[PDB]
From a paper:
BlaC is a broad-spectrum β-lactamase which confers resistance to all classes of β-lactam antibiotics in tuberculosis. BlaC from M. tuberculosis, an Ambler class A β-lactamase, uses a conserved serine to attack the β-lactam ring (blue arrow), thus inactivating the antibiotics. Specifically, we have obtained time-resolved crystallographic data on the binding and cleavage of the third-generation antibiotic ceftriaxone (CEF) in microcrystals of the enzyme β-lactamase from Mycobacterium tuberculosis (BlaC). In our MISC experiment, the small microcrystals were rapidly mixed with CEF “on the fly” using optimized mixing devices, and structures of the reaction of BlaC with CEF were determined by scattering from femtosecond X-ray pulses at five time points (unmixed, and 30 ms, 100 ms, 500 ms, and 2 s after mixing, respectively) during the reaction in both crystal forms.
We have therefore crystallized BlaC in two different crystal forms. With polyethylene glycol (PEG) 1000 as the precipitant, needle-shaped crystals are obtained with one molecule in the asymmetric unit. The solvent volume as estimated by the CCP4 program “truncate” is on the order of 59% for the shard-shaped crystal, and it is substantially lower (28%) in the needles. When measured by the program Coot, cavities with diameters as wide as 90 Å can be identified in the shards, and only 20-Å voids exist in the needles. Since stacking is not observed in crystals that pack in the same way as our needle crystal form, it might be argued that it represents a non-physiological, non-specifically bound substrate that occurs only in the environment in the shard crystals.
Residue numbers in the entry: 29 to 293
Write the structure that this text describes.
């Protein structure tokens, strides 16, 4: 009945909802618009940190990266406070995952692929994980603003779930690197009202959110049942009918996750 429940969510919230939960050995795949493109918004910062971690020795995380206040062209709660100091790469990975800092992400992009090639190199990193569908094309903030229907800066819940399933559950990062990506997302500050709110509090929830224009509200998560069985949950939504300033409805994501929690019970 999962289709009819998800469709009622789309009726009630006036939204397009995309859900993908990969099949496990015990469970079938839960999928709803799972192969439609949704904007990444800030969800790309999780694989972005993975890409930085993967390409460099843990020594790189202590390289201090300098930037100005004019480099702050986006919501940057943490970077905001060093508009001349500089941060260490590990702290940008931190700010980019936990506070969704936009400046952190732009700097992490530049670290990854240089001044002109950050989004191509990020995209290439996903390609190397077997994701041939996702694309990042702009930096912060333009990547949150592409028109509905535009393929630029989009992923699919299917693609980003499979990517996530390789980063946290798979062997895409060495144990220590994997451990730090898992740490940052589990200490996220932004996801309380989305997938986390839809899952019973003794399931473990690790996530990275994205929010953008056209009512875009995303959460990608790995969750662990009380007995430790891991599931990956990608929930993406937009409310494009309302125009660029349409309000995102976090509660839609929480509800999606509640349905997911009820079939993985």
């Amino acid at each position: 009945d999962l289709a009819d429940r998800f469709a009622e969510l789309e009726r009630r919230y006036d939204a397009r909802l995309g859900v993908y939960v990969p099949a496990t050995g015990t469970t079938a795949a839960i999928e709803y618009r799972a192969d439609e493109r949704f904007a990444f918004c800030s969800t790309f910062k999780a694989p972005l940190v993975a890409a930085v971690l993967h390409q460099n020795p843990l020594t790189h995380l202590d390289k201090l990266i300098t930037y100005t206040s004019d480099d702050i062209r986006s919501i940057s709660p943490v970077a905001q406070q060093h508009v001349q100091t500089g941060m260490t790469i590990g702290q940008l990975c931190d700010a980019a995952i936990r506070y969704s800092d936009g400046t952190a992400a732009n700097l992490l992009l530049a670290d990854l692929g240089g001044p002109g090639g950050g989004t191509a190199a990020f995209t290439g990193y996903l390609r190397s994980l077997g994701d041939t569908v996702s694309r990042l094309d702009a930096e912060e903030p333009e990547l949150n603003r592409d028109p509905p229907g535009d393929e630029r800066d989009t992923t699919t819940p299917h693609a980003i779930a499979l990517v996530l399933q390789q980063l946290v559950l798979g062997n895409a990062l060495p144990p220590d690197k994997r451990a730090l990506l898992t740490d940052w997302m589990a200490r996220n500050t932004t996801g309380a009202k989305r997938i986390r709110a839809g899952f019973p509090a003794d399931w473990k929830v690790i996530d990275k959110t994205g929010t953008g224009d056209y009512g875009r509200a995303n959460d990608i998560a790995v969750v662990w049942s009380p007995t430790g069985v891991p599931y990956v949950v990608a929930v993406m939504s937009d409310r494009a009918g309302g125009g660029y300033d349409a309000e995102p409805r976090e509660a839609l994501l929480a509800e999606a996750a509640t349905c997911v929690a009820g079939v993985l019970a």
